[PDB]
Amino acid sequence: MTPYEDLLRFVLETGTPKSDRTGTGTRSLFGQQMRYDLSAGFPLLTTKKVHFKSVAYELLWFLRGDSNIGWLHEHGVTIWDEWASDTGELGPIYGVQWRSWPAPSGEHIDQISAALDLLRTDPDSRRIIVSAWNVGEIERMALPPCHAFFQFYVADGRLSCQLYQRSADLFLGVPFNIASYALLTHMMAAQAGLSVGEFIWTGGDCHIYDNHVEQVRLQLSREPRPYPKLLLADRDSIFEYTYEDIVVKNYDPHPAIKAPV
Amino acid sequence: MTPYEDLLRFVLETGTPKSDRTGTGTRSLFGQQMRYDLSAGFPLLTTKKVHFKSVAYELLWFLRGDSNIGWLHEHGVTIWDEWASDTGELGPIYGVQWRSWPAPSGEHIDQISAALDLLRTDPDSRRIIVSAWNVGEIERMALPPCHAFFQFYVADGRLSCQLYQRSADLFLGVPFNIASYALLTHMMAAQAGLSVGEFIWTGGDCHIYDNHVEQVRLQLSREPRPYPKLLLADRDSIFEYTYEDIVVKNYDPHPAIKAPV
Ligand SMILES: Cc1nc(=O)c2cc(CN(C)c3ccc(C(=O)N[C@@H](CCC(=O)O)C(=O)O)s3)ccc2[nH]1
Ligand SMILES: Cc1nc(=O)c2cc(CN(C)c3ccc(C(=O)N[C@@H](CCC(=O)O)C(=O)O)s3)ccc2[nH]1
Ligand SMILES: O=c1ccn([C@H]2C[C@H](O)[C@@H](COP(=O)(O)O)O2)c(=O)[nH]1
Ligand SMILES: O=c1ccn([C@H]2C[C@H](O)[C@@H](COP(=O)(O)O)O2)c(=O)[nH]1
Structure with missing residues (x-):
């Protein structure tokens, strides 16, 4: 089962050429879907080595409800650095909304x-x-x-x-997004006394950047391997998980594929 | 091409039995998709007669930004009467958010x-x-x-x-929803000088109500007929469309199937 490689291949082959905000150019499809049975394995990609450390910390960062990259920075994760102000601020992004969505009443709503x-x-x-x-x-x-x-x-x-x-x-962000949400689903399941079912990824604008075509073709030439297994230490609250509470067992990916500069 | 009836059949056959808010009981699947090519035809179902008039007035009502069933009632549409207050108020639902989402600044955002x-x-x-x-x-x-x-x-x-x-x-709401969004897509297309493409319907909890099973089987037993064609009169603003502007040509459905008591 390779939902992600299937989709990447599909978009590479039938995507429409299309201009964008970054001016880089893309091939693109709309409304595509992936499904992983999380009980079958954790969908950390094996066709290239995915930097899970950064995935995990980014998610923990979201769960803290931080708007500032400082904490991410202290754990060596730089994926959000470009976009920050000089004081570190990103604005009311993901975590702020997850944990403290401001209602007109002056209440902040903890959706998680x-x-x-x-x-x-x-x-x-x-x-x-x-x-x-x-x-x-x-x-x-x-x-x-x-x-x-x-x-x-x-x-x-x-x-x-x-x-x-x-x-x-699809090349850069999506592998992170899949692992992030699968991890989140494990954490939520653990905290709710449930086991994991499916993760369904539904995308709007699904694109491959014009400057990732070689990196993609290389990745598609590789034979997928057994998914790793996710384990979690026991905690009182989702907000108390730490990086160290997470283990990825038997992760055996093909080599990393660097993103173009 | 019958994405709706296929999905209907699929939930009936493979969906899991599941309790719910109304107390009725359902059979259910999660994360299901339907795609319609809007250039091939307008997806007003033919396997039963769908009250398009209710559909169109509801959409025009959303576009008006109304929170009160009034305008709807006056036009012989009753689908929201049951949920309304003594004043006929529904609170800040679809239309109010579409046309006037309250930002923390005090500004109201017309998303449409x-x-x-x-x-x-x-x-x-x-x-x-x-x-x-x-x-x-x-x-x-x-x-x-x-x-x-x-x-x-x-x-x-x-x-x-x-x-x-x-x-x-799936039985009661979705046939309206499909028509309504296909209709809005035509309006947006005309207003932006675009032609129509795909309507992609992505569902979360997709269910058949226990009390709809017999009606569902009837609908599944019928052979689909060609889809009708949408004909939309010219307006210089989406907000100026009226019911009279909206014509459905060559709609030839099987008889209506009433929502059981
Ligand atoms: C065009 C675009 N695509 C993205 O995926 C993107 C992602 C973020 C934040 N984020 C959601 C990111 C997820 C993965 C990233 C990246 O740098 N990936 C390297 C990891 C290098 C490392 O940290 O060891 C890689 O996977 O090759 S960045 C901000 C602007 C963006 N802009
Ligand atoms: C459990 C539940 N199912 C629904 O489909 C539903 C729909 C609305 C409002 N709305 C979105 C509706 C779309 C279609 C409707 C229905 O009664 N249709 C009948 C004809 C009624 C009419 O034409 O006025 C039919 O389709 O057989 S009602 C509010 C609460 C609900 N609650
Ligand atoms: O967690 C993330 C963050 C960003 N992006 C990508 C998608 C787009 O290519 C770009 C965002 O730019 P816009 O879609 O807003 O133009 O970054 C992701 O795929 N996952
Ligand atoms: O445009 C609509 C409005 C409502 N519903 C149905 C979905 C649910 O059966 C019910 C809402 O109940 P909850 O999902 O909130 O329990 O109404 C639809 O299918 N389409």
């Missing part, structure tokens, strides 16, 4: 706690939603959210998660 | 105009989004938004739209 609370007390709910798409605050963000909106689902004790990603840099 | 603007001046944008999922105002709503979040995409002068529908009553 709310979601977990629903998984525990009313798992059949069709409203277990977290949205980072705060129409009123987009303009103050350094970048509008790419992974914008996500929903949980429970069936026979198993937790599934679907993410709507409006904009999908 | 902002999307149209992007379609006209920056059609390559990957940020052409409209969201009804306003976390801070959900509690004030009669019902949380089902069709929650949608995005536009342009390629080769062709406009596509993807809808994220967090919750979908």
